[PDB]
């Protein structure tokens, strides 16, 4: 007889126990709550309905809109929720022996979904290792295993994206006894090299940003990724991996050459990263600013900051992309200047003009522009100090900074006239 649309309730009351219960059958709280009409119908269909071996009980504890005793039959479970699923009459085995097949699994409240998918793939590989199947799997068994491996590689790539790459380690086959599987691992390795090439200083500059502190951080992040990739490559270059490359080999050679290029590019990136740390200290001397004063002191401080950059090119010497780095510098200076300019004017400038009782403030707006001129003057002075290889391209690179100054100058030209009226 066992239990019907109550057999499962009773079993869960004993099994769930929170480490000390074994309650046996019916849950008083579920009956006492009497929720919900939709839930009663779903549960009734599960109980004596055919055709459907599933139900969830969701605990979900605290958080927001917790499922709690969820649960539903099929449907969905959200999030710290803790619930479970049981198998009854797994299409229909009902009206005869009480779903003897019923399978039970507990599910806590707490990516995790990706880890569960990897575990499912491992279970499928174990099943393939055990039996051959009853032909429902047929040959597709090995093909299904290959698809699971591809899904695992995709999950590894997702972890690298959220995480720091390492797609190649996920791509490499695990406990291989075929040749095609090794090729699939190699294809994943090629994608990792492409990702390093795709990242560039110019792309960040195109999408606004280009702050002096941000450029140094981007170089440091790129250097860290390259260092992690170099460490990953050591792990990636296993004895077994080398053997796969030997057994047909142009594709292996292209990734190996890409890895060597990354090791070089990576050394250049490390030099860039030391320069970036110096720039980051310069950015802190600007990021720290509370947007109060600063320009009357920053303008004086601009000449020494410019001088340190001049010295940085000489110390490195083998620094790759030196012309490209310059573009990053000018971008950092202009971006820092724009933030300072906005604080000086914005709502405060509009409030003053409306009151029309402040003149000294109008002079202060001109003083902020002077600070901008001093940075350009210091940059020019730095070029003379640099003696050749001026680079910079401020004419077009400095147009952004120049355009902001021109707009500010027009306001100053008009603001002065208003005082005269």
């Amino acid at each position: 007889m066992g239990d019907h649309s109550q057999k499962d309730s009773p079993e869960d009351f004993i099994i769930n126990r929170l480490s000390q219960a074994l309650g046996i059958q019916k849950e008083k709280i579920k009956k006492s709550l009497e929720t919900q009409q939709d839930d009663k119908g779903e549960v009734t269909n599960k109980d004596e309905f055919q055709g459907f071996i599933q139900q969830d009980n969701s605990t979900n504890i605290l958080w927001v809109s917790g499922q709690s005793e969820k649960c539903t039959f099929y449907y969905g479970q959200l999030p710290p929720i803790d619930k479970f699923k049981k198998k009854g009459i797994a299409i229909k085995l009902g009206l005869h022996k009480l779903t003897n097949e019923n399978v039970a699994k507990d599910v806590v409240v707490v990516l995790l979904e990706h880890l569960n998918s990897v575990f499912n793939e491992i279970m499928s590989p174990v099943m393939q290792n055990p039996l051959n199947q009853q032909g429902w799997t047929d040959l597709v068994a090995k093909d299904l295993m290959e698809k699971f491996n591809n899904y695992v590689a995709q999950v590894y790539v997702l972890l690298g994206q959220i995480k720091g790459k390492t797609m190649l380690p996920l791509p490499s086959h695990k406990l291989t006894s075929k040749d095609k599987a090794h090729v699939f691992e190699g294809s994943i390795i090629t994608w990792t090299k492409q990702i390093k090439n795709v990242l560039k200083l110019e792309p960040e500059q195109l999408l606004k940003y280009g702050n002096d502190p941000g450029p140094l951080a981007e170089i440091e992040f790129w250097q860290n990724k390259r260092d992690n990739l170099n460490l990953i490559d050591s792990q990636l270059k296993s004895v077994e991996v080398q053997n796969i490359l030997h057994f047909l080999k142009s594709t292996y050679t292209t990734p190996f050459t890409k890895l060597q290029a990354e090791v070089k590019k990576a050394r250049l990136e490390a030099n860039e990263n030391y320069r970036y740390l110096f720039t980051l200290k310069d950015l802190f001397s600007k990021l720290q600013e509370s947007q109060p004063s600063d320009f009357p002191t920053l303008y004086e401080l601009f000449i020494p900051i410019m001088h340190t950059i001049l010295l940085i090119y000489n110390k490195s010497k083998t620094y790759n992309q030196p012309p490209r780095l310059v573009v990053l510098i000018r971008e950092i200076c202009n971006a820092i200047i724009s933030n300072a300019q906005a604080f000086v004017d914005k709502d405060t400038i509009f409030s003053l003009i409306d009151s029309k009782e402040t003149t000294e403030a109008c002079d202060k707006l001109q003083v902020t522009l002077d600070v901008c001129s001093k940075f350009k003057d210091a940059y020019f002075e730095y070029k003379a100090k640099a003696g050749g290889n001026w680079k910079l391209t401020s004419n077009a690179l400095f147009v952004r900074l120049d355009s902001f100054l021109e707009r500010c100058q027009d306001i100053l030209h008009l603001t002065n006239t208003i005082v005269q009226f």
């Binding site: 099994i15 074994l22 059958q25 969905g76 699994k105 599910v107 997702l158 972890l159 995480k163």
Partner: protein
């Protein structure tokens, strides 16, 4: 192992009897293991070792055993515990340091695992519609996580779809071998049915749908053939030397070439108007379709059929867009602006047709249906152009001039009547359209005289 060991013991005392029972009290087991001894050590490890993040509770058929190594057990139903972290936290509930799963011993796991994967995928989809979820690197990394989740969903769908001398003298019998041969011969007939129908006129979903259906159909047919019993029958026939069935099954079944064709159709479907309402969408649909059609180099007739279906869908979308843009009542100038957008789409189609013709010429040079399809495409392009011209005339009248405006309105009314007939019956539009063209020319002449005055 962790001293908060009683928390795991209490939990197992409750769970084990439900999974490895029908409630009541499971025979005390963990205690047996702790007094050998092997079970006690393994449990200790499970609780405390960061390393072996897993532990298995395995129910075998009644006997119990606690050990991380997993052996399929039937008739067994089991609960597996896995501590994962190092040193069990005595200071927190044990149910909150373990995850529990009950596995079925030699019972349809291939379905329970699939259901669990589907639930995980649904939760991931909800998180994606929610906040961060993938976290980690995010942005690109989050997009990569979404792609991985989509792949997992596809795997779950695939799982749902999935859901010699051992006879002695029985081998050699004309009845036995003949029934085998007869069945295999009928199998060949049945496979031949799936491996000729003229394309004629079909909906965009139709062609795409039957190419996809050929993919999944021949796919399952190959699953049937790949089974060892189906092959074993052919092996028995080969042993009985009844080579008629074996050779006919290996060469007459068009599954090899037919299967390849089905795969090509599936690829075309993956690569790829009837859902457009605006003229912009008509043109955009034509653009996307023609870019999708570039995968050609990678049978000529099969490729041509797919292309024809796509072209038909685009034409239907364009007509709908024009309608969206009472023609006589509407001002000619206003009509022209709407008409112009439609006209631009038509021009693009004509350019595409010219490119197609060039490709056909190259094929002709190489070797000493497709032509008909090209002619049909040209006819479709011509029809679109005529509609555009009528719209343009109305616009010109509006630009002109009270008299000019009146002339434009009359032209619009005639166009509207033609459009209504087309909407009425799809067969009527085919037959109705031919009749309309003759009528339109007469109407145009009358309009021209008024314009001259």
């Amino acid at each position: 192992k962790y001293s908060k060991r009683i928390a795991w013991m209490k939990t197992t005392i409750c769970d084990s009897l439900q999974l490895k029972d029908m409630i009541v009290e499971e025979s005390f087991q963990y205690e047996k293991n702790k007094n050998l001894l092997e079970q006690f050590l393994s449990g200790e490890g499970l609780n405390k070792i960061f390393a072996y993040y897993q532990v298995q509770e395995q129910a075998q058929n009644t006997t119990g055993d606690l050990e991380k190594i997993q052996d399929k057990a039937v008739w067994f139903l089991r609960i597996t515990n896995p501590a994962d972290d190092k040193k069990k936290a005595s200071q927190q509930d044990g149910n909150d340091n373990d995850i529990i799963f009950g596995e079925i011993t030699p019972n349809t796991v291939p379905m329970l695992n699939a259901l669990m994967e589907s639930v995980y995928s649904r939760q991931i989809d909800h998180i994606i519609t929610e906040k961060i979820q993938f976290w980690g690197v995010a942005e690109e990394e989050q997009v990569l996580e979404f792609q991985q989740h989509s792949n997992k969903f596809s795997s779950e769908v695939r799982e749902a779809i999935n859901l010699d001398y051992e006879a002695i003298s029985g081998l050699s019998e004309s009845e036995k071998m003949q029934h085998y041969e007869m069945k295999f011969n009928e199998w060949i007939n049945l496979i031949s049915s799936q491996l000729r129908k003229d394309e004629k006129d079909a909906g965009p979903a139709t062609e795409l749908i039957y190419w996809r259906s050929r993919m999944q159909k021949i796919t399952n047919w190959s699953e049937q053939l790949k089974s060892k019993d189906f092959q074993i029958v052919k092996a028995s026939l080969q042993r009985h030397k009844n080579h008629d069935n074996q050779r006919p099954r290996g060469d007459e079944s068009k599954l090899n070439e037919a299967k390849d064709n089905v795969k090509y159709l599936t690829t075309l479907e993956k690569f790829i108007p009837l859902y457009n309402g605006t003229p912009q969408q008509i043109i955009d649909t034509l653009p996307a379709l023609m870019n999708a059609i570039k995968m050609i180099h990678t049978t000529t007739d099969k490729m041509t059929g797919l292309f024809i279906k796509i072209t038909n869908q685009m034409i239907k979308n364009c007509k709908d867009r024009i309608l969206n843009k009472m023609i006589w009542e509407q001002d000619p100038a206003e009509l022209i602006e709407v008409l112009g957008s439609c006209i631009k789409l038509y021009c693009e189609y004509k350019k595409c047709y010219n490119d197609t013709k060039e490709k056909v010429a190259d094929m002709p040079k190489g070797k000493t249906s497709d032509a008909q399809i090209f002619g049909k495409f040209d006819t479709f392009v011509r029809r679109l152009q005529k509609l555009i011209e009528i719209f343009s005339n109305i616009q010109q009248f509006n630009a002109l001039l009270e008299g000019m405006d009146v002339l434009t309105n009359k032209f619009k009314k005639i166009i509207d009547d033609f459009k209504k007939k087309g909407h009425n019956l799809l067969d009527t539009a085919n037959n109705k359209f031919d009749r309309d063209w003759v009528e339109f020319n007469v109407e145009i002449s009358h309009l021209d005289g008024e314009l001259q005055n």
